[PDB]
């Protein structure tokens, strides 16, 4: 039906080496993003490297928000809906700074009788949400390359 195996990598050709700056470099989001960039064959430099032409990915605030999403017939929460909202910027050097964000929605049913199990489930959901947001940021790099090229054409 016209389908052909993808030619170019997920990351652009010009970001195949890139600095992963962050404010909390040992956290869980920076770990998720670092692992994702590894799986795509991206060379990760320290923030302290002397190379200047290399682009950089700066990670911003991560804001997990858990709220009620659906109440039973007696007020009690029946379903918590969780959001992750990763913000980040990419500072291609010699050009502008392109911001990229993410947003992961997850939900799960509340259960007071097994509250400890639901807290373990919430922690597992949050780890997976970090993984999803890390995926979503790395799927926005091609748009950044396209915008950079378009600015070059201008």
């Amino acid at each position: 039906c016209g389908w052909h195996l993808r030619d170019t990598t997920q990351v652009p050709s010009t970001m195949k080496v890139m600095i992963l700056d962050s404010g909390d470099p040992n956290g869980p989001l920076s770990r998720a993003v670092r692992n994702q960039l590894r799986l795509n064959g991206v060379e990760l430099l320290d923030k302290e490297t002397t190379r200047k032409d290399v682009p950089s990915l700066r990670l911003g605030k991560v804001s997990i928000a858990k709220d009620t999403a659906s109440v039973f017939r007696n007020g009690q929460t029946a379903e918590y809906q969780m959001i992750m909202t990763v913000n980040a910027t990419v500072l291609i050097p010699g050009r502008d700074i392109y911001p990229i964000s993410a947003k992961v929605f997850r939900s799960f049913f509340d259960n007071p009788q097994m509250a400890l199990a639901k807290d373990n489930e919430q922690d597992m959901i949050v780890k997976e949400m970090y993984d999803r947001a890390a995926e979503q940021l790395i799927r926005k790099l091609p748009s950044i390359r396209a915008a950079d090229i378009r600015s070059d054409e201008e």
Partner: peptide, 8 residues
């Protein structure tokens, strides 16, 4: 079953 619930 101290901490195990069915996940979605």
């Amino acid at each position: 079953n101290y901490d195990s619930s069915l996940l979605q």
